[PDB]
Structures are given as structure tokens and as C-alpha cells.
């Protein structure tokens, strides 16, 4: 099985640098041209560049040719991409590919000034009813939300986060429940932000 | 740069249908056209290379065709694993360029949203900011419009929204919009409303509250 395993992604401040890697296995790496491709949140695929087996030809998409350096180390079966002067627009998932036939799973670059911060959780109180939790001002992604420690799953929608202009994320989770249950049934949203080690249980009522 | 155009960005289908996705190039690309599938988890696979050669591992229900400028991917009978986004790519001239993508989804009957408005909590207001939330629950099709109004002033530039992925059980979408104001702006006004337009509503639905009532 052809396998391509990326690593080296993370948080980087604007103007910083990062080198990402792609470790190949299950084929003869030294025999192939390799490609890098990226995808910004909610956008399409964009080609970055290609390198031939002996590194004598390296082709870049013209807009990135000064920013980015592709290289490879055949003895190590690894392909590299060096990113410099990164900006917000470079925030993306970065994929390696053997030609365009086999793709890595991706590693993520987030370019941001924001510091790690756990969310504030606010109620979206009911008054079929809907209720929810607003999970506001955290960094970086992800957060997870359950209801009633996972006993409540039907009618739940946990929305994708939005990146606010502060550089911090905000998401909502909501559930629709019978109006008659409201006086009697307890509803607690369980929020876990692993990157800040923050857990909050928020009870929501009328 | 060769510009690749997939002029349908969203395409509805039923399980078992033949589906066709179209791509066109801004100038001739001599059959150097790849098709990619990106699944919901983000995994990318090559399906078809050189216009019509099936990549190893790909079932023959996928096929491709075309030349010069115009190309199509056909899925002969849609399976649930095929609900994904498809991108074309030309590799005739550097830089290689991709289409904007076509996302498949499942057709069902039109269903109007249930709409709910949520005032900001007193807890949040203590910190100096008010978030007002509008929820549009279980609608189809995906296209919907929310307009915020504060004492009849249309609000623009001070909301954000996001939409769930198509539900696996009922094939609907839900949407959440948040309007953000300072506490000081929030307390200067009374009537807060979200007005929702959608194909299932014969005219727009407004949900509103009066602050402090």
C-alpha cells in the first residue's frame, strides 16, 4: 500500500517560518515526481509546486515562488516544504501527492497572532422549543459539545465555528425538544476545549 | 494561467441516478485533465486521469470524457459514498490549475425552516458584548437568507453565519446566524428581529423580541 504521512503543521505567528514533511512508504520514492497542494478553510484546492526525482527541476505556482521552497531527501523517503514570511492567507491544509495519484491526509497550518484561550459558554434559553449554548471566544480549534453527557443526541445541531475579527472562534450548539419537557427535563451542554484544557458544563433553562 | 470553470458549484441528485459534472478550460488543454473526489472528512482521491483513464482502485461506475476545452465526469449510478465534492484539474501548462469544485447533495422535497431568535444572556452583557442568535432549523434546499434589523435599521457587516452539513437521516440543513453589538449599542434599542427568506416560505418569516420584555 502506497502511504504518505504528513507532519509538521501547527500554529505560527504572521511573518514566521515552518517546514512541513511528508514521509513516504510502500513504493520506490526516488522514482517519482512529487507535488504539494493546499486548501484554505471553506475554499478549493490550489497547486503549490512539483519536484522531480533528482531535484534538478522544481516548479512553483508563480505567486508562491519566493515564499516557499520545496526539497526532498530520497534516502529518507521524505518530501519537504519550507514556508517563510507566512501570512493569514497561508492558513490551510497542505497535502503532498505522488504525481497526482496518491495523496497524503494533510497537515494544517494556522497563521495567527491570537493566544490559546478557552471559551465562555452562554445560554440560548428556550421560550417544540429550541435551546442551546453559545460557545464564544476561543482559540485554536477544535471544541466539542455534548448534551446531557451524551444521553441527548436526537435533534442536536452543533454548527461549524466562525472566525471572528478578533482572531477568536465562536460556535453555537442547539437542540429542539418538546415544549412540555421544559419544566421537568434538565439540559446541560458539556463543552470541552482540549487545546486550553477547559471543560464547562452549562445548564440551560427558560 | 489556464482558468478551469465548474459552473455548478452545487448539484442535487438521488441515490441510483446517473450524475454528470462539467468542467471547462479557458483554452485548449489537449486532454490533460484530472478528476478528484474530496470526501466530507477531507480525504482527496484521484478518480480519472488523462480525461478518461480510471485510476487504480476506482470503480468503473466513474468515467470521464471530453476534449479541447470541454469535459465531464459521469457517475453511472450514485451511491452514498459518492456524496462528496469533485474538482477538475488541468496539467497541460504550468501552473496546474483546479476548478472551483462541485459538491453533490441528495434531493428531497422543499421543507421550510422553523425559526427561533435568542436574546443575549445577562451573563454575556456583564462582559460588555451582546450576541443575538437566529436559528433556522431543518430546511431544504440549502439556500436561505437572513436579514437582521434593529429598530427597523437593516444591519450589515456585524453578523456571521454557518450552516450544517446535510443531515444523513432527513436530508435537511440548519443555519445559525449571530449578530454582535456592544452592550452600550444593545441597550440603546428596543426591537431586535431576524427576517428569513426561503423557497418553502410563501413570504418571509420575521422572529423578533423587545429588549427587557
UniProtKB/Swiss-Prot annotation, chain A:
Annotated segments matching region Disordered: 114-127
Disulfide bonds: 133-189
Domain Ig-like: 119-205
Top-level taxonomic group: Eukaryota
Sequence segments annotated as region (CH1): 114-204
Variant or mutagenesis effect after changing residue 203 to R: In IMGT allele IGHG1*03
UniProt disease annotation: Multiple myeloma: A malignant tumor of plasma cells usually arising in the bone marrow and characterized by diffuse involvement of the skeletal system, hyperglobulinemia, Bence-Jones proteinuria and anemia. Complications of multiple myeloma are bone pain, hypercalcemia, renal failure and spinal cord compression. The aberrant antibodies that are produced lead to impaired humoral immunity and patients have a high prevalence of infection. Amyloidosis may develop in some patients.
Subunit annotation: Immunoglobulins are composed of two identical heavy chains and two identical light chains; disulfide-linked. Interacts with FCGR1A; this interaction mediates IgG effector functions on monocytes. Interacts with FCGR2A and FCGR3A.
Function: Constant region of immunoglobulin heavy chains. Immunoglobulins, also known as antibodies, are membrane-bound or secreted glycoproteins produced by B lymphocytes. In the recognition phase of humoral immunity, the membrane-bound immunoglobulins serve as receptors which, upon binding of a specific antigen, trigger the clonal expansion and differentiation of B lymphocytes into immunoglobulins-secreting plasma cells. Secreted immunoglobulins mediate the effector phase of humoral immunity, which results in the elimination of bound antigens.
Protein name in the entry: Immunoglobulin heavy constant gamma 1
Organism: Homo sapiens (Human)
Gene it is expressed from: IGHG1
From Swiss-Prot, chain B:
Xref: PROSITE patterns: IG_LIKE (PS50835), IG_MHC (PS00290)
GO biological process: adaptive immune response; B cell receptor signaling pathway; immune response; immunoglobulin mediated immune response
Source organism, top-level taxon: Eukaryota
Gene: IGKC
Source species: Homo sapiens
Entry protein name: Immunoglobulin kappa constant
Compartment(s) of residence: Secreted; Cell membrane
Assembly with partners or alone: Immunoglobulins are composed of two identical heavy chains and two identical light chains; disulfide-linked.
A matching Pfam family: C1-set
Location of the Ig-like domain: 113-210
Cysteine disulfide links: 134-194
Cellular component per GO, a single term: IgD immunoglobulin complex
CDD domains: IgC1_L (cd07699)
Key words of the record: Adaptive immunity, Cell membrane, Disease variant, Disulfide bond, Immunity, Immunoglobulin, Immunoglobulin domain, Membrane, Secreted
Function description: Constant region of immunoglobulin light chains. Immunoglobulins, also known as antibodies, are membrane-bound or secreted glycoproteins produced by B lymphocytes. In the recognition phase of humoral immunity, the membrane-bound immunoglobulins serve as receptors which, upon binding of a specific antigen, trigger the clonal expansion and differentiation of B lymphocytes into immunoglobulins-secreting plasma cells. Secreted immunoglobulins mediate the effector phase of humoral immunity, which results in the elimination of bound antigens.
Gene Ontology molecular function, alphabetical: antigen binding
Disease: Immunoglobulin kappa light chain deficiency: A disease characterized by the complete absence of immunoglobulin kappa chains.
Amino acid at each position: 500500500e502506497v502511504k504518505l504521512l504528513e507532519s509538521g503543521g501547527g500554529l505560527v505567528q504572521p511573518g514566521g517560518s515552518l517546514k512541513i514533511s511528508c514521509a513516504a512508504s510502500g513504493f520506490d520514492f526516488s522514482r517519482y515526481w512529487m507535488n504539494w497542494v493546499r486548501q484554505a478553510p471553506g475554499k478549493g484546492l490550489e497547486w503549490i509546486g512539483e519536484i522531480n526525482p533528482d531535484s534538478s527541476t522544481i516548479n512553483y505556482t508563480p505567486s508562491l515562488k519566493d515564499k516557499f521552497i520545496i526539497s526532498r531527501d530520497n534516502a529518507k523517503n521524505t518530501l519537504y516544504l519550507q514556508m517563510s514570511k507566512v501570512r493569514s492567507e497561508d492558513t490551510a491544509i497542505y497535502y503532498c501527492a505522488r504525481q497526482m495519484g496518491y495523496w497524503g491526509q494533510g497537515t494544517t497550518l494556522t497563521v495567527s497572532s491570537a493566544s490559546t484561550k478557552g471559551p465562555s459558554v452562554f445560554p440560548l434559553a428556550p421560550s417544540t422549543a429550541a435551546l442551546g449554548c453559545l460557545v464564544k471566544d476561543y482559540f485554536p480549534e477544535p471544541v466539542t459539545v455534548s448534551w446531557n453527557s451524551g444521553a441527548l443526541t436526537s435533534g442536536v445541531h452543533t454548527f461549524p465555528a466562525v472566525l471572528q475579527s478578533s482572531g477568536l472562534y465562536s460556535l453555537s450548539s442547539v437542540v429542539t425538544v418538546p415544549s412540555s419537557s421544559l419544566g421537568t427535563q434538565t439540559y446541560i451542554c458539556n463543552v470541552n476545549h482540549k487545546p486550553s484544557n477547559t471543560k464547562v458544563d452549562k445548564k440551560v433553562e427558560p | 494561467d489556464i482558468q478551469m470553470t465548474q459552473t455548478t458549484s452545487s448539484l442535487s441528485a438521488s441515490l441510483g441516478d446517473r450524475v454528470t459534472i462539467s468542467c471547462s478550460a479557458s483554452q485548449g488543454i489537449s486532454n490533460y485533465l484530472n478528476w478528484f473526489q474530496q470526501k466530507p472528512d477531507g480525504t482527496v482521491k484521484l478518480l480519472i486521469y488523462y480525461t478518461s483513464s480510471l485510476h487504480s482502485g476506482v470503480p468503473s461506475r466513474f468515467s470521464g470524457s471530453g476534449s479541447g476545452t470541454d469535459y465531464s465526469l459521469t457517475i453511472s449510478n450514485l451511491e452514498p459514498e459518492d456524496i462528496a465534492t469533485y474538482y477538475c484539474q488541468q496539467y497541460r501548462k504550468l501552473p496546474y490549475t483546479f476548478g472551483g469544485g462541485t459538491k453533490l447533495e441528495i434531493k428531497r422535497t422543499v421543507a421550510a425552516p422553523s425559526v427561533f431568535i435568542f436574546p443575549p444572556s445577562d451573563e454575556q452583557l456583564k462582559s460588555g458584548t451582546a450576541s443575538v442568535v437566529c436559528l433556522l432549523n431543518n430546511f431544504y434546499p440549502r439556500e436561505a437568507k437572513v436579514q437582521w434589523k434593529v429598530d427597523n435599521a437593516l444591519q450589515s457587516g456585524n453578523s456571521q453565519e454557518s450552516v450544517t452539513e446535510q443531515d444523513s437521516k432527513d436530508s435537511t440543513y440548519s443555519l445559525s446566524s449571530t449578530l454582535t453589538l456592544s452592550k452600550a449599542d444593545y441597550e440603546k434599542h428596543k426591537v431586535y428581529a431576524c427576517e428569513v427568506t426561503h423557497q418553502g416560505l410563501s413570504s418571509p418569516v420575521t422572529k423578533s423580541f423587545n429588549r427587557g420584555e
